[PDB]
From a paper:
To date, more than 10 MARTX effector domains have been annotated, including several domains of unknown function in Vibrio species, among which the fifth domain of a MARTX toxin from Vibrio vulnificus CMCP6 is a Ras/Rap1-specific endopeptidase (RRSP). RRSP catalyzes sequence-specific cleavage of the Switch I region of the cellular substrates Ras and Rap1 (18, 19) that are critical for a myriad of signal transduction events, including innate immune defenses. Structural and functional bioinformatics and cell biological studies revealed that RRSP belongs to the TIKI superfamily, and it is composed of an N-terminal region mediating its localization to the plasma membrane and a C-terminal region responsible for cytotoxicity. In this study, we determined the crystal structure of an RRSP from the sepsis-causing pathogen V. vulnificus CMCP6 (VvRRSP), and we demonstrated that it is a metal-independent TIKI family endopeptidase.
Given that the catalytic residues of VvRRSP were successfully assigned, we hypothesized that substitution of catalytic residues with nonfunctional residues might stabilize the active site and the adjacent flexible region. We subsequently determined the structure of the RRSPE3930L/H4030L mutant at a resolution of 2.3 Å. The structure of the mutant RRSP is essentially identical to that of WT RRSP (RMSD of Cα atoms is less than 0.5 Å), with minimal differences in the conformation of the active sites containing the essential residues. Like WT RRSP, the active site of the VvRRSPE3930L/H4030L mutant is arranged similarly to that of BcR135. Luckily, the flexible region spanning residues Arg-3988–Gln-3992 in molecule A of the mutant is ordered and adopts a loop structure close to the active site. To evaluate the involvement of this region in the function of RRSP, we selected Arg-3988 based on its interactions with the Switch I region of Ras, dominated by negatively charged residues. This residue was mutated to glutamate, and the overall conformation was confirmed by CD spectroscopy. In vitro KRas cleavage assays showed that the mutation completely inhibited enzymatic activity, suggesting that the flexible loop may be involved in substrate recognition. No differences in the active sites were observed between WT and mutant RRSP structures. Therefore, these results suggest that residues Glu-3900, Glu-3930, His-3902, and His-4030 in the active site may spontaneously adopt the catalytically active conformation in the presence of substrate.
Residue numbers in the entry: -4 to -1, 3596 to 4068
């Protein structure tokens, strides 16, 4: 009857039963209550994002007025005083990416106190223009705890499951791709390699095949947007921890680029290695005769050698380091650096080989993919020298998703690796590192400046010829 409905309605109006969506807001509120540091700021941006999403979906909900006010109080707390200076740019980002906004927010707090003026605007501009900082949903839902490894993706292979499985199992029986686990009931692979790491193993056909089917599954998950297979894998299948770690590291690298532009002594680099300094180094070099004396000039009051490699052949650097390893050793060199290999994926494999004398399948596949001579590693091990991988984790692609940010990111991250691995060897120990010529020079783009490897390590960029003649390459202005 109408009485029963009248009573039901009076009860409903007084104690509005809580939907799933409003429950999410209350849960998120508790997080604002309990969290500390940057977590509390992120939780506050995420509270706001939940409120906006709620009001959008329940336009005529009675709860909107009290949620709106809550949203303004939160916003007022966050952007009080000088923090309002960066508010418009940070809040616009917080609309889609609360954790990202919170990181920038912490930087803006410092900028309000007068640290690194300009960094905040730089981070905001990257967040808007770098395709890799765009909103990335990734894989949502429960992920297994069993895996002996950190999953980077959880990819539903659908129709490509059987092929992927075959080539994965062929790979695993040859010691490759061990950090991958199949769940047949959902046709998914839990995958412990990044897109870029896999690409570095495709000298092995079985990996190349597995990689091919992985990519097909990705393309089929998103046929409509123009996203590459790599970007699709992130936005649709990335583990959430992996996403955070990517976003975090990219923000770190932007700060790195910023600091390096102010703290690198480029004035002194140009005095030593341009103009008169260059003329003088070139003259002293040309008067020396043979490998021994050229080395002594190049390493005189310098921590190492930087040798350029050109796209195509000119593998003269790789050849030289191998054939003349003894002459390098006698001049104090104890470390050989290769931009050809990625530090995260390769260094554990390299180190285990130098310790045990046993080369893993995985390293053997990487060397093959990169066309590196196994004898370099044997000659290094026999000579007591360490080989170190110098590249970061992103695409070497001079084009990455259509902007300059991929280029700057790689140069930034490679600069950091170089400083950590090459810049402070024990007293007397020198290095020889081989870089592609693009990293040796500075990046002077409209979208930002990055010091060259040369600038960061206070060294000239070198070229070695078919007859072991060194020359100093002029700075790319």
């Amino acid at each position: 009857g109408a009485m029963a409905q009248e009573l039901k309605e009076r009860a409903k109006v007084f104690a509005k039963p809580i939907g799933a969506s409003y429950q999410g807001i209350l849960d998120q509120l508790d997080l604002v209550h309990q969290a500390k540091g940057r977590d509390q700021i992120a939780a506050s941006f995420e509270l706001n994002k939940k409120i906006n999403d709620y009001i959008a979906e329940h336009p005529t909900s009675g709860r909107n007025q009290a949620l709106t006010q809550l949203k303004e109080q939160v916003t007022s707390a966050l952007f009080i005083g000088k923090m309002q200076v960066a508010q418009a740019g940070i809040d616009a980002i917080a609309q889609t990416r609360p954790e990202l906004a919170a990181r920038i927010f912490m930087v803006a707090i410092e900028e309000a106190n007068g640290k690194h003026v300009g960094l905040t605007d730089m981070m905001v501009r990257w967040a808007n223009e770098d395709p890799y900082l765009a909103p990335k949903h990734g894989y949502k839902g429960e992920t297994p705890s069993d895996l002996g490894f950190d999953a980077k993706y959880h990819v539903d292979l659908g129709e490509h499951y059987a092929d992927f499985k075959q080539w994965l199992e062929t790979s695993q029986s040859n010691g490759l791709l061990s950090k991958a686990t199949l769940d047949e009931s959902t046709k998914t692979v839990h995958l412990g390699y990044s897109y870029q790491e896999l690409q570095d193993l495709t000298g092995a056909e079985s990996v190349q095949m597995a990689f091919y089917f992985l990519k097909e599954a990705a393309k089929k998950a998103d046929p409509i947007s123009g996203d590459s297979a790599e970007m699709i894998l992130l936005k649709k299948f990335a583990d959430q921890s992996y996403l955070s770690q990517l976003d975090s590291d990219r923000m770190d690298q932007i700060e790195g680029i910023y600091r390096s532009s102010h703290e690198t002594d480029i004035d002194a680099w140009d005095r030593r290695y341009s103009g008169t300094g260059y003329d003088e180094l070139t003259n002293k070099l040309a008067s020396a005769t043979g490998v021994d004396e050229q080395l002594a000039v190049l390493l005189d009051d310098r921590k190492g050698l930087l040798i350029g490699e050109v796209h195509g052949s000119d593998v003269n650097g790789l050849r030289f380091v191998n054939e003349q390893m003894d002459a390098l050793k006698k001049q104090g060199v104890t470390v050989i650096g290769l931009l050809h290999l990625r530090s995260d994926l390769a260094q554990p494999l390299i180190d285990r080989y130098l310790a045990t004398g046993v080369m893993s399948s995985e390293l053997s596949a990487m060397l093959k993919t990169k066309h590196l001579d196994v004898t370099l590693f044997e000659n290094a091990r026999a000579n007591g020298m360490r080989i170190v991988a110098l590249d970061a984790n992103s695409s070497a692609r001079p084009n990455v998703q259509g902007t300059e940010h991929g280029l700057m990111y790689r140069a930034g991250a490679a600069n950091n690796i170089a400083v950590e691995v090459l810049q402070n060897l024990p007293d007397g120990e020198k290095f020889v590192a081989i870089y592609g010529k693009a990293l040796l020079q500075s990046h002077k783009g409209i979208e930002g400046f990055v010091p060259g490897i040369t600038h960061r390590l206070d060294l000239p960029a070198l070229k070695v010829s078919d007859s072991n003649q060194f020359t100093v390459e002029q700075d790319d202005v």
